Amino acid sequence: PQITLWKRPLVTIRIGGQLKEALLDTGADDTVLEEMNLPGKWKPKMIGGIGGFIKVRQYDQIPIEICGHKAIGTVVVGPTPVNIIGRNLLTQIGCTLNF
């Protein structure tokens, strides 16, 4: 598909029994999800942007479906205001910027 940027590039993703809306975000190195109690091992991390840093939990090898495209990789979980699909998964679903 092609997604214009007139509005926020929000798409439906699936992470377990949770369908959520997430931003396809070329400005994000990694995928950041709103607080959710995922199973499995994690590692503590801090990620920073405008306004400063937040504390997140990093989970590895998490399957996520993005617009019906399968992905699997690292996701961090914490008090973000929006779900963010970062480059680590955007590459997996074959996403490019074009102008």
Ligand X SMILES: CC(C)CN(C[C@@H](O)[C@H](Cc1ccccc1)NC(=O)O[C@H]1CO[C@H]2OCC[C@H]21)S(=O)(=O)c1ccc(N)cc1
Residues with active-site annotation:
25
Nearest to ligand X of 30, 89 (CB atom): 30
Backbone angles phi, psi at 88, to 5 degrees: -55, -30
Give the Cα separation of 40 and 73 in Å (integer).
Answer: 14
Please select the residue that binds a second copy; options are 2, 37, 40, 61, rule is CB under 8 A: 2
Please select the residue that binds a second copy; options are 15, 24, 33, 64, rule is CB under 8 A: 24
- What is the footprint of ligand X within residues 13-72 (CB under 6 A)? 23, 25, 27-30, 32, 47-50
57 three-state secondary structure: strand
Q: Which two tokens stand for residue 3?
A: 């997604």
**Buried-state track 70-80, b at ≥16 Cβ within 10 A, e below 16:** ebebbbbbbeb
99 binds, among a second copy, ligand X, none (CB under 5 to 8 A by kind): a second copy
What does the binding site for a second copy look like in residue numbers (CB under 8 A)? 1-6, 8-9, 23-29, 32, 47-54, 67, 69, 79-82, 84, 87, 90-91, 93-99
